[PDB]
Design a protein around this ligand. Structure first.
Ligand SMILES: CC(C)c1nc2c(OCC3CCCCC3)nc(N)nc2[nH]1
Length: 291
């Protein structure tokens, strides 16, 4: 760690503090993360250093010293959460939403092809630069250190982007969980409001049900035998997407519906999503960032 000079506290992640830092040797400006000895974690994280892609925040270095783990990441200057908050008055223009979605799906398709999932996508871990790129941060960290209810600061970990199979207690969930989360973020970029802002697991589930309909054996074979499924769940009818994400056009609503399929086996893959007609006219606009 002596090789790094902390510039500033960026914030507090799930596992530890995140610092903006300078490498005293390379001159590099970086995101330095403190993770709150386990050899299985070392080995997992070392596999991540290999998983390199332009829409994945690069893991530069893993440093295990004194019973302590530090991850050194590529640094980006702004996150999607703050960008959305700053664009709240007129919205992010559709061509930019589409470009970001497209790039994030390329990110997922890559990781998923290597059997690596994120599990905790959220606006705060999607990072953007001045050139119009967006990148997924902290990929793979969840299978290394788990997802707690509270962070080390007791901050509440958000449920808003959590897939229904996780909430229903599936232990062996798939890459489809990341597609669900990205669908939720897509809807939020469009409407400028979170799609399912649950404040407990049941509230999260019940918000999902109220918009997409309570799932049953017709739309999701196997659903009623999931660990946390209860026959006593209220039965809500599904809303039309035209009501859920106006003014998203038919191509967008079509794609979003496939990202939000209940059955993870029906839910569109990242690769198939990249071929959806929504992306026919996709471009790469540059955002206006005040840094
Ligand atoms: C200057 C701000 C926008 C910033 N944050 C970064 C970051 O992660 C910090 C967050 C990760 C997700 C959870 C909250 C902290 N990770 C990386 N690599 N760069 C960042 N740049």
């Amino acid at each position: 760690m002596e090789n790094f000079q902390k510039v500033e506290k960026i914030g507090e992640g799930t596992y530890g503090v995140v610092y903006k830092a300078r490498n005293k040797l390379t001159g590099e400006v970086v995101a330095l993360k403190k993770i709150r000895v386990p050899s299985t974690a070392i080995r997992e994280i070392s596999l991540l250093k290999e998983l390199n892609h332009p829409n994945i925040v690069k893991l530069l270095d893993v440093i295990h010293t004194e019973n302590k783990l530090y991850l050194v990441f590529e640094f980006l200057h702004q996150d999607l959460k703050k960008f959305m908050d700053a664009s709240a008055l007129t919205g992010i223009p559709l061509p930019l939403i589409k470009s970001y979605l497209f790039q994030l799906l390329q990110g997922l398709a890559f990781c998923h092809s290597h059997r690596v999932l994120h599990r905790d996508l959220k606006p705060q871990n999607l990072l953007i630069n001045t050139e119009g790129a967006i990148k997924l941060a902290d990929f793979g960290l969840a299978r290394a250190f788990g997802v707690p209810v509270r962070t080390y600061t007791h901050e509440v970990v958000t449920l808003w982007y959590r897939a229904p199979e996780i909430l229903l207690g599936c232990k062996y969930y798939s890459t489809a969980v990341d597609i669900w989360s990205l669908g939720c973020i897509f809807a939020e970029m469009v409407t400028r409001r979170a799609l399912f802002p649950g404040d407990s697991e049941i509230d999260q589930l019940f918000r999902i049900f109220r918009t997409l309909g309570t799932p049953d054996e017709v739309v999701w074979p196997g659903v009623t035998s999931m660990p946390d499924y209860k026959p006593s769940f209220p039965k809500w009818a599904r809303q039309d997407f035209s009501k859920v994400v106006p003014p998203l056009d038919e191509d967008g609503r079509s794609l979003l519906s496939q990202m939000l399929h209940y059955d993870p086996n029906k839910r569109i893959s990242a690769k198939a999503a990249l071929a959806h007609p929504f992306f026919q006219d996709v471009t790469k606009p540059v955002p206006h960032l005040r840094l």
